[PDB]
Design a protein around this ligand. Structure first.
Ligand code: ZN
Length: 864
C-alpha cells in the first residue's frame, strides 16, 4: 500500500449532493479548489462506487482542461484523472460532476430504513465516512492528514430536514423541481474528510443553549422529542467542562446530536453533527432501564470529547487511532464523574476497560498497543479490546503520573499548537513533557511499543518510624512466571497510600529499575500500606503475607476506597489462579468483605467466586465451598432484604438481585424458602414479583425444584407476552439439576418455540448450571453438531457457543478432547476461540490439581 502522490493537495471542497430517494441513488457536483505542488499530467484521488460523468481542471484565470483519461481501481479505491497537458504549479479549480448510490452497506452515503409514527417504511440519507468511506459519497483525498475546508449543499424536499457539520446559511428553492429546496451550509474549518457529515430525513428536535453560548440540539425520530431531553442537558453541560479543561472554546457555532433508527456504527463523532442510535441516545420511559441515564452520560461525553481531541487535532495516520479513541475513552469518565459524582464512575471503569485489558494482555498471542498500520484495512485486524481498553488505561495511569495540573497545561499546549493540523503520538508526549518536565516519551514507549504488563511484588520492613519497601517487577502471565529470556521491563509510575491517608498519595514514584527500594517516612507498624492508589497504574500488585494481613482491617472498616478494594480482590484471584499465591490465602480475605456495600465490588466478587465454585464442582467437597459462599453473602443479604427500602438507588436493586441469586444457588435455606413464596404467588396470580427479583427467584426455585417446577417455567415462557420476559427465562432454564430435565432444556433450545439467535443462551445456561449439565451440554452439541454447525457457521454465535460450553471444564484430558473434536469437525471462524478455551481449560486444570486438597483442608478447619 502507498498513499496518494500529494502532488495536488486540496484547499476547499464545494459539494452539492441531491439525494435521489426511492431510487436509492444520488448525483452531485464537486468544485474543489486545489494547489498543484508539483507539475503533473494526472491527479490521483480516492473514489469508490461512483462513476464520474466529466471532470476538468481550471487553473487560476485560465480555461479549463477537460480530463480525457479515467482509471478506476476498485481494489485500492483510487482513481487517476489524466489530462492532455501538464497542469503546472499554481492554484486551480477541479470541477467534477458524478453520480453515486445510497447503498445498503451502512457505509459512506447510504440509506437508513426508518418507520413513520404510522408505518409506510421510509428511507433516509445518512452518512458515515470513518474510516475510508468518504470516497463513496464524493471523490476526494480521503486521508486524515490531507485536511481542507468543505462547502456542503443539499437539494432536499421541503418536507425533510437537512443537517450537516455547520449551520444553514441559505435555503433557496430549486428551479428544476418545485418540490425541492437547495440548503447551503456554512464553510467548515480545516478538517479531515472522514469527519464530514450530512443527513437527510424527518426529525424532531429539542434545543438549549450552553453557558458558552453554543446552540445545542438533540434530533429525535418523529414524535420522540421529549426522549432526547436528558441527552440535551448532558451535552449542554459537557461543552463547558471540556472548555474549562482544555482552555479552548468549542470550535464550531453549533452542536447537533441526532438519534438514528438502527444506526449500525453505533455512534460517530462527526464535527458538529454527532450521530447515535436511538437505543443509545434517547431514554424511553417505558422501555429504558435504570442505569440508562448513566450510559447516555458516557456516550455523550465520549463523542463530545472528540470535538477537541480528534477533530480539532487529528491523528497523522490510522496508526495513532488507539490514542484518539483511548483518550476519549478515559476523559469520558472524567467528565461524567465531575457532573455526576454519585455514580462513582471510576469504579465501573476499572471493572470494564481495565480488568478486561489485563485479561487479554496476560495471555498468549497478545500485541502492543501501537502497531504500524500500512493498508487502512489492517486497522480492523490489529485493533481490538487491547488497543482501546489498555489504551484508555495507560492514559489514566499517565494522567495520575503527570498530575491534573500539568496534564491540563500540556493538553492546552497540544491543542493550540496542532489546531486544524495533524500530529502523531510522539507529538503528544512532547507537549506533555514540556509542561511537566517528566520523561513522558521514554515511559510511554514501554507501555506502547511492547505487549504485556508487569507484576509488582512489594515487601515491607519496619525501620524505626519509617517503613522500608522492597519492590521488584516481572512480566505477569495468567499461567504463572513468564517463560522467556527477553525479560521485559517497564517504567512503572507507582502511587502509594497508607491508612493515615487512604484517599491521597503518600508517595509517588517511578520504577525505572528491575528492583527498587522505597522508604515511607513516619509510617507506624499499626498502619497498612496500599500500592496503586485508585488502581490507576496498569499492573498487578503482589503483597507479602504480612502486608496482605495489614490490609484486612482496611477492607473491613471500608477505609480502603472501593476502587482499591476492587483491584486488590481482582489481583488476588489472578495471582492464585497463576500459582503465584495459594487459593487458601485468597479465601481468608473473602471474610473481610462481609461489610462491602458497593455493587461493583460484589459483582466482581460474585464473578470470581463463581469461577472458583464451578471449578471446585469437579471435587468431592462442592458442598464445602457452597457453605463458604453462603457465609460471605449472608450479611449483605440480610442488610438488603427482599423489598426495596425507602429511598434506595438503582444499584441497590441490582445488588439485591445479585446477592439473592448467589445465596439461592448456594442453597441458603432462608433464601430458598422465601423465593418459593414469591414464585408460588407469582404463578397463581396473587402478586406478580418485581422484574428485579425475577431472575434470582427463577434460578433458585428451578435449581432446587423438580419436573413440576420446570413445566411451570415452560408454561411461563410459551405464554410469555413479550420477548424480554422470554429471554429472562431462557437464561435460567439451565439451572435445573436433574439429568432428564437437563436433556429436556437442551431439546427445548432447538425447538420452534426458541428463536435461533437465543438458542446459544439456553445451552449456555445449561453448561454453567452444574458439572453434569456442562458435560451434557458438551455432548449435546456433539450429537447435534451437523444442525448446530449449519445454523451459526461463519458467525459470532458459533464462537460464543463453543466458549460458553467448554470454558468450564477443569480436566486437562478434556482440553485435548475439544481440540480433537474440532480437528475432525472443523470450525474455521472460531479458530481463535478454541485456542483461548484450550489454554483456559489447561489453566483451570493445573489450578485445580495444585490447590484442591489445600482448599479442602482449609474449609474443614475453618468450620471448626
Ligand atoms: Zn470515539
Amino acid at each position: 500500500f502507498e498513499r496518494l502522490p500529494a502532488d495536488v493537495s486540496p484547499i476547499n471542497y464545494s459539494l452539492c449532493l441531491k439525494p435521489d430517494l426511492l431510487d436509492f441513488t444520488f448525483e452531485g457536483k464537486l468544485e474543489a479548489a486545489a494547489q498543484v505542488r508539483q507539475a503533473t499530467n494526472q491527479i490521483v484521488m480516492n473514489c469508490a462506487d461512483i462513476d464520474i460523468i466529466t471532470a476538468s481542471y481550471a487553473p487560476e484565470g485560465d480555461e479549463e482542461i477537460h480530463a480525457t483519461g479515467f482509471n478506476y481501481q476498485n481494489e485500492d479505491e483510487k482513481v487517476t484523472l489524466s489530462f492532455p497537458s501538464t497542469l503546472q504549479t499554481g492554484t486551480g479549480t477541479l470541477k467534477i460532476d458524478f453520480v453515486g448510490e445510497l447503498n445498503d452497506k451502512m457505509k459512506g452515503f447510504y440509506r437508513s430504513k426508518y418507520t413513520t409514527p404510522s408505518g409506510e417504511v421510509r428511507y433516509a440519507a445518512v452518512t458515515q465516512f470513518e474510516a475510508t468511506d468518504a470516497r463513496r459519497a464524493f471523490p476526494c483525498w480521503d486521508e486524515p492528514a490531507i485536511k481542507a475546508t468543505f462547502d456542503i449543499s443539499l437539494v432536499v424536499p421541503k418536507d425533510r430536514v437537512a443537517l450537516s457539520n455547520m449551520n444553514v446559511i441559505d435555503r433557496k428553492p430549486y428551479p428544476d423541481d418545485e418540490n425541492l429546496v437547495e440548503v447551503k451550509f456554512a464553510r467548515t474549518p480545516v478538517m479531515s474528510t472522514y469527519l464530514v457529515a450530512f443527513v437527510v430525513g424527518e426529525y424532531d428536535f429539542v434545543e438549549t443553549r450552553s453557558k458558552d453560548g453554543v446552540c445545542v440540539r438533540v434530533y429525535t425520530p418523529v414524535g420522540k422529542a421529549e426522549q432526547g431531553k436528558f441527552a440535551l442537558e448532558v451535552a449542554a453541560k459537557t461543552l463547558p467542562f471540556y472548555k474549562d479543561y482544555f482552555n479552548v472554546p468549542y470550535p464550531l457555532p453549533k452542536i447537533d446530536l441526532i438519534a438514528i433508527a438502527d444506526f449500525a456504527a453505533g455512534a460517530m463523532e462527526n464535527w458538529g453533527l454527532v450521530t447515535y442510535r436511538e437505543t443509545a441516545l434517547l431514554i424511553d420511559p417505558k422501555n429504558s432501564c435504570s442505569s440508562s441515564r448513566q450510559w447516555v452520560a458516557l456516550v455523550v461525553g465520549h463523542e463530545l470529547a472528540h470535538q477537541w481531541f480528534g477533530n480539532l487535532v487529528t491523528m497523522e495516520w490510522w496508526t495513532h487511532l488507539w490514542l484518539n479513541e483511548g483518550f476519549a475513552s478515559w476523559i469520558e469518565y472524567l467528565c461524567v464523574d465531575h457532573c455526576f459524582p454519585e455514580y462513582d464512575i471510576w469504579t465501573q471503569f476499572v471493572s470494564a476497560d481495565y480488568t478486561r485489558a489485563q485479561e487479554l494482555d496476560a495471555l498468549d498471542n497478545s500485541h502492543p498497543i501501537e502497531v504500524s498500520v500500512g493498508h487502512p484495512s489492517e486497522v480492523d485486524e490489529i485493533f481490538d479490546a487491547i488497543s482501546y481498553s489498555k489504551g484508555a488505561s495507560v492514559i489514566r495511569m499517565l494522567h495520575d503520573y503527570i498530575g491534573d495540573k500539568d496534564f491540563k497545561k500540556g493538553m492546552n499546549m497540544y491543542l493550540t499548537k496542532f489546531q486544524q493540523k495533524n500530529a502523531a503520538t510522539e507529538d503528544l508526549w512532547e507537549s506533555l513533557e514540556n509542561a511537566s518536565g517528566k520523561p513522558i516519551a521514554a515511559v510511554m514507549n514501554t507501555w506502547t511499543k511492547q505487549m504485556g504488563f508487569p507484576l509488582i511484588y512489594v515487601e515491607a520492613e519496619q525501620v524505626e518510624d519509617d517503613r522500608l519497601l522492597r519492590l521488584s517487577q516481572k512480566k505477569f502471565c495468567a499461567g504463572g512466571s513468564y517463560v522467556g529470556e527477553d525479560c521485559p521491563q517497564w517504567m512503572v509510575p507507582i502511587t502509594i497510600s497508607t491508612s493515615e491517608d487512604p484517599n491521597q498519595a503518600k508517595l509517588k514514584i517511578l520504577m525505572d529499575k528491575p528492583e527498587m527500594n522505597v522508604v515511607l517516612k513516619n509510617v507506624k507498624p499499626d498502619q497498612w500500606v496500599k500500592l496503586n492508589l485508585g488502581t490507576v497504574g496498569f499492573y498487578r500488585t503482589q503483597y507479602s503475607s504480612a502486608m496482605l494481613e495489614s490490609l484486612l482491617p482496611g477492607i473491613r472498616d471500608l477505609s480502603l476506597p472501593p476502587v482499591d478494594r476492587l483491584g486488590l480482590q481482582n489481583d488476588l484471584f489472578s495471582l492464585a489462579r497463576a500459582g503465584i499465591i495459594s487459593t487458601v490465602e485468597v479465601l481468608k480475605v473473602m471474610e473481610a468483605f462481609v461489610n462491602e456495600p458497593n455493587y461493583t465490588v460484589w459483582s466482581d466478587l460474585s464473578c470470581n467466586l463463581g469461577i472458583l465454585s464451578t471449578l471446585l464442582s469437579h471435587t468431592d467437597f462442592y458442598e464445602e465451598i457452597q457453605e463458604f459462599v453462603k457465609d460471605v453473602f449472608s450479611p449483605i443479604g440480610e442488610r438488603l432484604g427482599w423489598d426495596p427500602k425507602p429511598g434506595e438507588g438503582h444499584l441497590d436493586a441490582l445488588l439485591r438481585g445479585l446477592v439473592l441469586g448467589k445465596l439461592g444457588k448456594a442453597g441458603h435455606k432462608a433464601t430458598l424458602e422465601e423465593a418459593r413464596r414469591r414464585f408460588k404467588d407469582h404463578v397463581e396470580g396473587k402478586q406478580i414479583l418485581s422484574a428485579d427479583l425475577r431472575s434470582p427467584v427463577y434460578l433458585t426455585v428451578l435449581k432446587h425444584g423438580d419436573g413440576t417446577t420446570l413445566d411451570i417455567m415452560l408454561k411461563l415462557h410459551k405464554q410469555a407476552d413479550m420477548q424480554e420476559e422470554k429471554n429472562r427465562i431462557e437464561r435460567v432454564l439451565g439451572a435445573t439439576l436433574l439429568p432428564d430435565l437437563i436433556q429436556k432444556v437442551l431439546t427445548f433450545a432447538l425447538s420452534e418455540e426458541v428463536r435461533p439467535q437465543d438458542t446459544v443462551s439456553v445451552i449456555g445456561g445449561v453448561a454453567g448450571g452444574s458439572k453434569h449439565g456442562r458435560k451434557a451440554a458438551w455432548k449435546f452439541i456433539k450429537d447435534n453438531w451437523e444442525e448446530l454447525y449449519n445454523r451459526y457457521q461463519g458467525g459470532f454465535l458459533i464462537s460464543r457457543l463453543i466458549k460458553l460450553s467448554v470454558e468450564g471444564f477443569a480436566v486437562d484430558k478434556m482440553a485435548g478432547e475439544v481440540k480433537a473434536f474440532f480437528e475432525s469437525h472443523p470450525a474455521p471462524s472460531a479458530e481463535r476461540t478454541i485456542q483461548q478455551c484450550c489454554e483456559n481449560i489447561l489453566l483451570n486444570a493445573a489450578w485445580l490439581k495444585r490447590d484442591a486438597e489445600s482448599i479442602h483442608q482449609y474449609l474443614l478447619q475453618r468450620k471448626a
